[PDB]
Amino acid sequence: MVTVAVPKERAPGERRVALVPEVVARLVKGGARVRVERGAGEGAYHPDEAYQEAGAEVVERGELLKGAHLLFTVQPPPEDLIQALEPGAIVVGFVQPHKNLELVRALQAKKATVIAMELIPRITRAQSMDALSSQATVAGYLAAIHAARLSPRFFPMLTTAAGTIRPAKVMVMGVGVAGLMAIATAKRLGAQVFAYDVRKAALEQALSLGAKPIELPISAEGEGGYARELTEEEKRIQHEALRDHVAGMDVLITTAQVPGRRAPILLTEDMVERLKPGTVVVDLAAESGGNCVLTKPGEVVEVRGVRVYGPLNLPSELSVHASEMYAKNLYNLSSLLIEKGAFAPKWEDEIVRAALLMKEGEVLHGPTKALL
Amino acid sequence: MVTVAVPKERAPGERRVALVPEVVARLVKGGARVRVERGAGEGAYHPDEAYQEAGAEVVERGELLKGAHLLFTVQPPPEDLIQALEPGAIVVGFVQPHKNLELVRALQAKKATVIAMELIPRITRAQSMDALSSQATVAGYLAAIHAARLSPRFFPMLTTAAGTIRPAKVMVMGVGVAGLMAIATAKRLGAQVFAYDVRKAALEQALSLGAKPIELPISAEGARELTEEEKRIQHEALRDHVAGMDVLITTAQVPGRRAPILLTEDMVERLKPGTVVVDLAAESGGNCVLTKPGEVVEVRGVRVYGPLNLPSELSVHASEMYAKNLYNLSSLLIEKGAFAPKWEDEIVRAALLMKEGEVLHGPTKALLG
Amino acid sequence: KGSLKPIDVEDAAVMLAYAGKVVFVPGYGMALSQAQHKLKELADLLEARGVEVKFAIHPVAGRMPGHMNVLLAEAGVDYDKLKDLEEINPEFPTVDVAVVIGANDVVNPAARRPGSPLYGMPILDVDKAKNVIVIKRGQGKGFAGVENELFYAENTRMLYGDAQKVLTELIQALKRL
Numbered sequence: 069m070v071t072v073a074v075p076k077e078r079a080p081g082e083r084r085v086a087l088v089p090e091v092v093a094r095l096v097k098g099g100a101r102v103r104v105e106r107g108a109g110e111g112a113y114h115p116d117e118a119y120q121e122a123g124a125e126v127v128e129r130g131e132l133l134k135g136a137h138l139l140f141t142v143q144p145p146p147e148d149l150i151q152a153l154e155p156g157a158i159v160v161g162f163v164q165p166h167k168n169l170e171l172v173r174a175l176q177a178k179k180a181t182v183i184a185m186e187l188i189p190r191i192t193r194a195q196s197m198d199a200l201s202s203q204a205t206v207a208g209y210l211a212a213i214h215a216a217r218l219s220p221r222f223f224p225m226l227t228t229a230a231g232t233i234r235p236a237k238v239m240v241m242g243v244g245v246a247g248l249m250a251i252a253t254a255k256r257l258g259a260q261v262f263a264y265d266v267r268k269a270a271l272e273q274a275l276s277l278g279a280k281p282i283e284l285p286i287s288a289e290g291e292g293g294y295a296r297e298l299t300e301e302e303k304r305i306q307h308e309a310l311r312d313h314v315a316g317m318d319v320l321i322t323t324a325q326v327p328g329r330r331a332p333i334l335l336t337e338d339m340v341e342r343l344k345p346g347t348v349v350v351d352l353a354a355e356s357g358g359n360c361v362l363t364k365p366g367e368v369v370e371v372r373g374v375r376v377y378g379p380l381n382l383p384s385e386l387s388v389h390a391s392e393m394y395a396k397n398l399y400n401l402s403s404l405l406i407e408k409g410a411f412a413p414k415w416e417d418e419i420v421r422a423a424l425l426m427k428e429g430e431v432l433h434g435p436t437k438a439l440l
Numbered sequence: 441m442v443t444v445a446v447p448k449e450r451a452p453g454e455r456r457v458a459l460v461p462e463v464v465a466r467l468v469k470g471g472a473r474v475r476v477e478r479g480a481g482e483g484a485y486h487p488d489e490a491y492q493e494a495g496a497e498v499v500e501r502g503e504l505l506k507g508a509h510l511l512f513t514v515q516p517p518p519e520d521l522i523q524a525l526e527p528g529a530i531v532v533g534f535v536q537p538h539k540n541l542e543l544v545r546a547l548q549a550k551k552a553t554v555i556a557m558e559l560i561p562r563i564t565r566a567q568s569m570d571a572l573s574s575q576a577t578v579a580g581y582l583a584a585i586h587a588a589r590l591s592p593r594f595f596p597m598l599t600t601a602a603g604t605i606r607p608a609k610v611m612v613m614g615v616g617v618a619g620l621m622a623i624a625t626a627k628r629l630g631a632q633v634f635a636y637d638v639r640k641a642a643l644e645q646a647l648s649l650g651a652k653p654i655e656l657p658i659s660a661e662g663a664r665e666l667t668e669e670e671k672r673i674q675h676e677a678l679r680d681h682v683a684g685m686d687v688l689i690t691t692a693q694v695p696g697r698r699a700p701i702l703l704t705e706d707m708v709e710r711l712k713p714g715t716v717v718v719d720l721a722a723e724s725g726g727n728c729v730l731t732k733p734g735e736v737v738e739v740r741g742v743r744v745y746g747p748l749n750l751p752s753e754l755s756v757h758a759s760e761m762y763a764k765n766l767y768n769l770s771s772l773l774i775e776k777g778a779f780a781p782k783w784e785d786e787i788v789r790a791a792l793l794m795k796e797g798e799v800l801h802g803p804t805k806a807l808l809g
Numbered sequence: 810k811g812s813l814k815p816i817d818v819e820d821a822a823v824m825l826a827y828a829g830k831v832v833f834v835p836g837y838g839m840a841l842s843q844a845q846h847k848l849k850e851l852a853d854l855l856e857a858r859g860v861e862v863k864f865a866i867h868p869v870a871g872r873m874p875g876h877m878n879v880l881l882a883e884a885g886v887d888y889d890k891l892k893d894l895e896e897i898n899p900e901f902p903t904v905d906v907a908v909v910i911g912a913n914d915v916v917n918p919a920a921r922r923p924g925s926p927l928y929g930m931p932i933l934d935v936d937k938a939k940n941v942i943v944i945k946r947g948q949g950k951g952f953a954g955v956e957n958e959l960f961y962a963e964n965t966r967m968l969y970g971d972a973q974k975v976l977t978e979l980i981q982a983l984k985r986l
């Protein structure tokens with residue numbers, strides 16, 4: 069009859085919580101115990117009494133992990149919780165080894181078992197558990213909102229007795245889930261939206277939201293979907309064409325990241341230099357370095373009247389709906405950890421196997437081994 | 441040759457500019473000379489060379505008013521500009537005596553002539569010149585944008601693998617030009633929008649944009665029937681309709697008066713934590729008691745934003761619309777490139793706040809004593 | 810097992826002309842086709858003929874969370890017309906015609922079965938409708954790359970074409986009746 073734990077997050081700017089009241093209520097109706105740190109939900113407007121009314125037990129950090137079989141976290145747990153971990157306990161949450169090397173190294177010493185939410189596989193059974201997608205959706209939405217807030221122009225075409233105003237030209241650079249939602253939200257607002265990505269698939273998906281795919285002289289892709297190794301010559305050409313497309317935009321929303329690497333640069337000093345004063349760059353890749361060379365993580369800078377913003381935790385801004393979706397993701401994942409109220413880790417199950425970063429100090433993820 | 445002069449706005453945090461280069465070029469082409477203060481359009485991202493390319497003379501501030509018949513301002517002229525005015529010259533801009541009584545007082549002393557842009561009549565005929573309409577549209581747009589930024593919840597409905605996100609319930613209290621644009625923008629973002637006003641016309645306009653009108657019933661044109669039975673009706677009813685809301689955007693204002701308190705304490709106490717209030721009326725007190733003008737506060741998890749000068753945030757399009765409003769008005773001031781004020785016109789008669797120093801607007805005159 | 814049974818736009822128009830209850834189920838194909846405005850126009854038209862019209866939105870239809878919602882909202886569809894599958898599933902048996910528009914994986918009965926790659930996906934019971942009309946260009950499979958037994962059911966008929974061109978033609982055919 070398992071007891072699952074949910075802590076108050078500690079990472080800079082983190083206001084999300086791994087489980088919200090309603091989802092905790094169902095886990096308890098389902099016959100599970102839920103230990104929740106004092107005030108873990110307050111960042112997402114879920115007070116301590118809300119969790120009590122859901123059948124959860126609100127306790128102190130340090131007491132949190134006694135008798136606990138499952139740690140459900142948003143960001144990876146700090147040292148103090150890693151020391152509090154018991155034998156057989158499973159850590160479930162984002163881990164992100166490239167940004168949390170020490171916490172991962174520490175997790176070996178205690179020899180804890182961890183399944184990482186970023187490694188939740190992209191197969192149909194795991195769709196309802198896909199935390200990257202849900203959180204990226206929040207980020208993409210807010211990226212567009214912040215873009216409109218920082219821009220000195222209207223997004224929408226406006227016509228009035230005073231005259232006619234063109235819609236803003238927004239380009240989303242990097243079209244994953246965040247990119248798609250950024251497109252969709254800028255499009256609802258009335259902006260003329262353009263899309264840049266190296267994948268034909270991403271570009272088709274951008275077109276399925278009314279965006280105009282930016283098509284460069286050299287196609288970045290070939291048959292098999294393999295990305296072209298571009299010559300230096302070909303590389304000089306893509307850059308110059310993209311520099312020109314980007315120069316004619318009023319807003320750039322950049323979202324390109326690659327698991328385990330610093331964010332690739334999509335806006336270079338020379339490209340930014342060709343942006344008109346008043347232009348706005350909302351750099352979603354700031355959390356892993358930024359696609360824009362001007363970006364200062366966590367800040368809004370303005371250089372040459374180009375306003376560049378590098379937000380670090382957009383999910384934490386939309387904390388209520390971001391938490392709600394994440395909780396459900398974890399709840400759906402708890403399928404493979406809990407059976408009829410019982411601690412039933414299905415190690416056998418692919419979702420567990422693909423996403424299991426560690427098993428009792430043993431590191432199973434290939435790339436995570438290479439880095440450490 | 442009529443010379444028009446454009447200053448660098450100097451009021452705290454004002455980034456708009458009265459004319460933008462493209463409007464300057466229309467005037468110059470129509471025969472008018474144009475002088476623009478060094479760096480005037482930098483708040484709206486029009487550099488000096490752009491005004492020069494349009495045919496205007498970019499000059500130093502102390503030089504700005506030599507030979508100029510028309511001074512076009514966004515906010516009222518400061519004293520250094522007031523003093524440099526020639527006889528025969530006419531100041532054209534927002535005046536609003538309440539924020540600037542001592543500058544208005546200063547204008548009558550100098551015996552200057554000024555057209556107040558807030559005294560444009562609110563009729564279809566005048567809408568090309570209507571600076572209140574254009575700038576309120578900007579304000580309403582940015583209100584919704586800010587509401588969405590401050591809310592911890594999605595505006596739109598989203599059906600996802602991780603559950604179904606319901607739309608934000610957004611109530612726009614006070615549906616004038618700002619409010620209606622706030623409805624349209626919240627609607628663009630996927631919110632379910634509700635609309636409250638004391639005037640049925642505003643309610644029909646809001647229905648037409650797809651908002652659900654709130655259940656009335658007062659006419660109050662034009663705090664009239666509002667304070668009939670002293671507005672206990674207003675307070676009573678919406679105390680129920682407000683509690684469901686995720687966002688309240690308030691814009692209610694009455695000319696020359698206190699802005700109505702639509703959000704009392706007992707009312708805000710029923711708002712669920714995470715609720716957002718965007719009080720546009722902050723400039724003349726708030727529609728909400730908790731509003732701290734120019735700031736975001738949070739009490740009991742209710743984020744209350746009292747923005748001042750949203751038009752300045754949208755400096756490019758605010759300036760553009762404003763400049764077009766003036767250009768259009770300038771048709772009643774210029775003849776084939778000649779200084780030809782249309783004293784007779786009923787728009788000029790309504791908006792001419794003073795002439796030769798004498799103050800012609802009743803409510804204003806009264807306040808000068 | 811069964812068979813692919815093509816239908817003309819005229820044949821589909823007659824089916825919709827006499828339907829009492831119609832459910833639109835849009836997928837990625839609607840979005841690629843940007844057919845949301847024509848689909849809305851069709852829904853308006855059927856309603857004005859007293860047809861009870863609803864939209865079933867699958868949780869993972871399209872290629873991003875809420876893909877169908879953002880497009881349908883763009884086209885002007887009412888939130889009260891958009892039903893999620895727990896609320897609309899039990900209703901399918903009394904649905905005279907379910908018009909599937911550019912959807913495949915989200916209307917595949919195979920997801921009920923544990924062996925199939927689609928197992929885990931919540932199931933939309935469009936196969937329990939009295940008649941199904943599927944709009945897709947031809948033999949293109951969905952994201953998951955599996956074939957659809959729905960397309961082979963006795964009560965399923967295939968309306969081949971680009972989603973918006975088809976819907977446009979359906980509206981014109983229906984206006985003539």
Ligand SMILES: NC(=O)c1ccc[n+]([C@@H]2O[C@H](COP(=O)([O-])OP(=O)(O)OC[C@H]3O[C@@H](n4cnc5c(N)ncnc54)[C@H](OP(=O)(O)O)[C@@H]3O)[C@@H](O)[C@H]2O)c1
Pocket residue numbers: 192195835836837838839841842868869870871872873874875876910911912913914915916944945946947948949950951952953970971972973
């Ligand atoms: N929603 C999400 O967030 C998300 C993200 C990633 C993956 N997925 C997965 O993606 C799939 C979504 O399911 P779905 O039923 O919406 O799409 P789907 O199963 O990928 O099928 C799309 C169908 O659209 C038809 N089509 C394409 N273009 C068309 C056009 N112009 N006109 C008419 N039809 C057209 C295609 O066939 P033809 O070539 O014959 O026209 C194709 O069969 C699910 O497998 C979901 O698990 C979802």
Ligand SMILES: NC(=O)c1ccc[n+]([C@@H]2O[C@H](COP(=O)([O-])OP(=O)(O)OC[C@H]3O[C@@H](n4cnc5c(N)ncnc54)[C@H](O)[C@@H]3O)[C@@H](O)[C@H]2O)c1
Pocket residue numbers: 241242243244245246247264265266267270295296297298323324325326327332334
């Ligand atoms: N769904 C997927 O297949 C997938 C794959 C990787 C990452 N992601 C995640 O999705 C989110 C969205 O980002 P994205 O993947 O849509 O960005 P993306 O598809 O645009 O790829 C990242 C960037 O890599 C650069 N790049 C790669 N090869 C290049 C080459 N040969 N020459 C020049 N440039 C090259 C491109 O500029 C590209 O924009 C990110 O958070 C990311 O972590 C998703």
Ligand SMILES: NC(=O)c1ccc[n+]([C@@H]2O[C@H](COP(=O)([O-])OP(=O)(O)OC[C@H]3O[C@@H](n4cnc5c(N)ncnc54)[C@H](O)[C@@H]3O)[C@@H](O)[C@H]2O)c1
Pocket residue numbers: 562563564565567572573576613614615616617618636637638639642666691692693694695700702
């Ligand atoms: N051509 C046209 O027809 C045209 C164009 C633009 C504006 N106008 C009119 O100009 C007039 C003023 O517009 P504005 O945007 O400057 O208004 P405003 O800045 O004075 O804001 C007041 C708005 O809030 C409402 N309001 C005021 N007190 C309220 C209260 N106690 N409770 C609820 N709502 C309250 C008002 O009815 C009005 O709609 C309006 O009548 C508008 O219709 C007409």
Ligand SMILES: [Cl-]
Pocket residue numbers: 586589590
């Ligand atoms: Cl803000």
